[PDB]
Amino acid sequence: KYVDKIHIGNYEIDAWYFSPFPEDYGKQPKLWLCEYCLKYMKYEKSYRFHLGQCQWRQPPGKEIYRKSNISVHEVDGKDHKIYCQNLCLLAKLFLDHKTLYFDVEPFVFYILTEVDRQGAHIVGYFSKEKESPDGNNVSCIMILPPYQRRGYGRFLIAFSYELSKLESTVGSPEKPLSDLGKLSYRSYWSWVLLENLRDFTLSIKDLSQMTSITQNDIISTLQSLNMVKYWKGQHVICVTPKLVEEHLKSAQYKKPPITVDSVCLKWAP
Numbered sequence: 001k002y003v004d005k006i007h008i009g010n011y012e013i014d015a016w017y018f019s020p021f022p023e024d025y026g027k028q029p030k031l032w033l034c035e036y037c038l039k040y041m042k043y044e045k046s047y048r049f050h051l052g053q054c055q056w057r058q059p060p061g062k063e064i065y066r067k068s069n070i071s072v073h074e075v076d077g078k079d080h081k082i083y084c085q086n087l088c089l090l091a092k093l094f095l096d097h098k099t100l101y102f103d104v105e106p107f108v109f110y111i112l113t114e115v116d117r118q119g120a121h122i123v124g125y126f127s128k129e130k131e132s133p134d135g136n137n138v139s140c141i142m143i144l145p146p147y148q149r150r151g152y153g154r155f156l157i158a159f160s161y162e163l164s165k166l167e168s169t170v171g172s173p174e175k176p177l178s179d180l181g182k183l184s185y186r187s188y189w190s191w192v193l194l195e196n197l198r199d200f201t202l203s204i205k206d207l208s209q210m211t212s213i214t215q216n217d218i219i220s221t222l223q224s225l226n227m228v229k230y231w232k233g234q235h236v237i238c239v240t241p242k243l244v245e246e247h248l249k250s251a252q253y254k255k256p257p258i259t260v261d262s263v264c265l266k267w268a269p
């Protein structure tokens with residue numbers, strides 16, 4: 001009845017949530033997706049015919065980041081409507097709270113790919129409203145299950161703040177976050193803040209300006225690190241250089257990151 005398994009690239013992936021693909025696409029045992037243009041198909045035969053014909057080998061839009069074989073494409077929902085709609089229906093298989101699939105024009109989509117000789121292979125993405133009334137620098141963020149917990153979510157989170165910095169603005173992901181989303185942002189925030197308190201008298205407003213993390217996300221992060229005191233109605237940073245290093249040395253920050261190299265980012269607001 002609902003779509004419950006997809007084939008994309010060389011992966012078969014079980015669905016986590018309902019996504020409103022048309023009814024007759026549900027009925028099939030599997031839905032088959034072109035990993036490059038994200039067209040969804042009902043049959044292994046139409047899929048293999050499509051694979052032989054389709055000329056795309058990367059996302060549409062502008063490649064705004066390239067370092068070695070990690071690429072980000074910026075895709076405007078108005079310019080590439082069908083691709084963005086396909087991406088949103090794919091995303092909704094793995095996001096409980098996403099509600100927007102068809103009215104994609106207000107959004108820009110940042111698609112993360114990993115490149116080999118065959119083409120640029122989609123790992124995940126984040127959407128962003130062109131005009132956010134609430135200052136959200138991410139709408140939805142999704143990493144395909146076989147790539148989760150492997151560094152790519154940290155990359156996209158970092159990337160979303162590097163855009164916010166180029167915008168001279170603070171930003172926060174739209175709520176609610178998934179369970180993994182919550183843990184991932186808290187861990188990203190903790191690292192960035194701890195490294196700034198090592199590398200540098202920084203105030204909370206100072207840190208917000210340096211990182212584009214909102215003051216509230218800074219404060220909730222420092223509270224979970226027990227690194228803020230409260231005085232006459234104001235949160236104030238309170239931490240020893242040694243306690244910062246204790247946190248940074250811990251086993252949580254020990255996996256080598258895919259880092260966003262701002263030299264390789266090509267973008268203006």
Ligand SMILES: O=C(NNS(=O)(=O)c1ccccc1F)c1ccccc1
Pocket residue numbers: 141142143147148149150151152153154155157180181183184185187188
């Ligand atoms: O895959 C995910 N997180 N684990 S991670 O990338 O190794 C990671 C490691 C350290 C800090 C933040 C991270 F994100 C993820 C999936 C969906 C939304 C957001 C993140």
Ligand SMILES: [Zn+2]
Pocket residue numbers: 034035036037038039050054055056
């Ligand atoms: Zn295709």
